[PDB]
Each structure stands twice: as C-alpha cells, then as structure tokens.
C-alpha cells in the first residue's frame with residue numbers, strides 16, 4: 001500500500017511529438033493520484049489559465065469514471081509562480097478566506113479531490129504566511145467535511161528537499177498535522193545554476209564520494225531522513241522521483257562528476273530548454289553516449305561529446321523504490337509523467353517506461 005502521485009503539466013501540450021501531452025494521454029490505472037500543474041490566483045480566487053481548461057474537466061470525469069479509486073488534485077505554485085504569485089492573496093485573513101472558499105467551491109464543481117500547495121519557496125520571508133495559509137486550508141477542509149456527504153478535500157504540499165531551504169521555510173510539526181502528505185521535491189540537487197560550475201547529478205540517492213560538508217546534504221537519502229527527523233512521519237513522506245535530467249556543456253576533457261562545465265547542456269529538440277532533458281529526449285541522447293552507473297550515488301550519468309547528462313533510469317526507479325520501502329515511506333511522487341516517454345515511441349520500452357517500472361516495483365512483494 002503505497003501512493004503513486006503523478007504530477008503533470010499544462011505546458012507540455014504545446015510541445016511537438018513526442019513531447020506532446022494532454023490529459024487524454026493519462027492512464028487511469030497508472031497512478032494512485034494525479035496532480036494538475038498549475039492553477040492561478042486572480043482576485044484572491046482560484047482559476048485555471050489553460051486554453052484546454054474545459055477539455056481537462058471532461059478528461060477528469062472520464063478518468064474517475066474508469067477508475068473510481070483515482071484521486072485527482074489541483075496544484076498551486078511551482079518555481080515560476082514563485083512567492084510573488086501568492087500576493088496579494090496571503091496578505092490578510094480576509095483575502096485568504098476569500099481564497100479558501102474559492103478553492104472549496106472550485107474543487108467540488110470540478111471534481112477535484114484535493115489541493116496541492118507547492119510554494120517555491122516560503123523561505124524566511126514567507127515562512128509565517130505559508131504556515132498560516134496551510135493551517136487555514138486544513139481547518140476549512142475539515143470544517144467543510146463536517147457538513148458533507150463527500151469525502152474530504154485532501155491537502156498536500158510540494159516541499160524542498162534542500163536542507164537550508166527546509167530550515168528557513170517550514171514549521172514541520174505543524175505541517176505534519178495539517179497536510180495529508182508531503183510531495184518531497186527530491187531532485188534539482190545539482191544543475192547549471194551552481195557556482196563553481198561543475199557537473200553534478202540532479203537526483204542522487206546517496207552521498208557522492210567527493211561530497212563533503214553541505215554537499216553531504218544534496219541527496220535523496222539525506223533529504224528524506226531530515227524530514228523524518230524534523231517531525232514528518234515517514235508515511236506522510238511521498239518521495240519525489242524525476243523523469244528528467246540536468247545537462248551540462250563540458251569546459252575541459254574531464255567527464256567525471258565535478259568536472260568543470262562551461263554552461264548548461266545543449267537544449268533538447270522538444271523541450272527547447274538548455275539545462276534539462278525529458279526522458280524521451282534522453283533516450284535519443286543515449287545512442288552513442290557512454291553511460292556510467294555511480295556506485296556511491298546509485299544513479300547514472302551519460303557523456304556524449306562535450307555533453308554530460310545526469311539522469312534517472314529504470315534501474316534507479318527500482319533502486320529508489322526499494323529504499324523508500326525500507327524507510328516506510330508513503331510512496332512515490334513523479335515530476336512529471338509528461339516527461340516520461342508516455343507514447344512509448346522514443347525509448348522503445350513501452351509507454352511510461354519509468355513510471356511503469358515504479359508501479360511494478362511498489363506493487364512487487
């Protein structure tokens with residue numbers, strides 16, 4: 001009994017094949033939870049800015065018709081929403097209450113089962129506001145369920161896997177009460193924003209051999225453990241796994257971890273964004289590359305020419321799943337199913353090779 005919580009996005013629809021994803025591409029039995037990314041906030045109220053908003057509602061109802069066990073949530077936030085997106089809604093209880101009531105009506109009208117708040121990030125400044133908003137939602141949700149024939153709206157949150165960010169942003173014990181679970185964002189541990197600019201893996205399970213001091217923090221094992229230590233019960237920890245990798249353009253001839261990089265990797269042809277590659281792009285890149293499995297860190301990286309791609313593959317799916325079960329975690333979260341090879345047409349491994357491996361690994365006694 002593990003959750004498989006699957007984020008998907010509303011921007012992947014503008015991609016060319018085979019990055020071209022709509023909710024209609026979703027398998028109703030693939031995951032236990034679906035989270036739509038992202039909603040917006042206009043007039044201290046919840047909306048959806050998506051030209052496919054209405055067809056999405058239609059797909060939601062089809063999905064839940066085919067799988068009555070399926071739970072679909074709505075997410076607010078993300079890296080680009082930032083902290084700014086939550087202003088001015090959080091600035092007072094009045095505007096906050098206006099919001100919380102928009103949410104309840106919204107989710108009921110549209111057949112969502114809860115809400116994800118993935119605020120990136122509260123940090124020091126907004127620690128208080130984030131805490132308060134979560135508590136007011138949690139309470140309003142409970143209150144609403146008091147007067148209901150419906151199951152109660154679930155509340156989750158996408159949270160930092162970064163030690164310092166966790167220290168600055170969260171009151172964990174409070175969070176443990178208010179949230180049904182965290183979606184631990186246990187990736188983006190390394191990437192081309194770093195200084196000094198050196199190759200590093202986006203989502204390492206374990207410590208690197210060269211990791212010392214606060215680099216010892218930048219792995220999944222650590223992140224997960226620190227959350228539990230800070231108060232979050234293990235079963236409320238839902239462990240994020242990525243379907244993308246972080247890329248680097250190599251400065252010199254070192255191809256190792258910690259090798260100097262001139263900048264982010266060449267942009268994928270489909271995701272057109274230098275620094276990362278979806279898995280369906282990674283599979284093309286792997287043709288003619290040399291791949292190394294890191295023993296220390298338990299994940300692969302691939303080199304082809306001056307390109308260095310740290311990524312996650314079927315082998316790390318199964319490896320990460322064993323770890324999360326060993327630690328009695330609540331399950332697995334995926335960012336994002338629409339960057340797996342969902343069509344099956346690039347990796348020739350069937351549809352959703354990575355997520356499918358995760359399902360199987362959780363499902364296996």
Ligand SMILES: CC(=O)N[C@@H]1[C@@H](O)[C@H](O[C@@H]2O[C@H](CO)[C@@H](O[C@@H]3O[C@H](CO)[C@@H](O[C@@H]4O[C@H](CO)[C@@H](O[C@@H]5O[C@H](CO)[C@@H](O[C@@H]6O[C@H](CO)[C@@H](O)[C@H](O)[C@H]6NC(C)=O)[C@H](O)[C@H]5NC(C)=O)[C@H](O)[C@H]4NC(C)=O)[C@H](O)[C@H]3NC(C)=O)[C@H](O)[C@H]2NC(C)=O)[C@@H](CO)O[C@H]1O
Pocket residue numbers: 007011038077078079080081118119120158159160161162163164165185187188189191193218244273276335
């Ligand atoms: C002060 C200082 O110097 N501090 C240093 C500091 O940098 C180090 O800490 C590290 O910082 C980095 C960067 O700030 C952190 O990286 C961020 O990590 C979070 C996770 O914690 C990421 O956000 C979530 O995760 C995914 C994957 O990255 C996010 O996905 C992105 O979402 C956006 C939308 O919001 C996507 O944009 C869309 O895509 C295209 C263009 O790319 C466009 O066409 C679309 O229209 C656009 N959509 C929208 C809505 O605008 C983007 O594609 C996508 N990326 C991918 C791969 O899918 C998602 O937003 C987040 N999910 C949820 C849920 O919230 C965040 O993306 C990521 N930022 C960057 C830049 O990659 C890092 O976590 C942090 N590390 C640690 C360990 O804490 C510290 C280290 O301590 O050192 C200091 O020195």
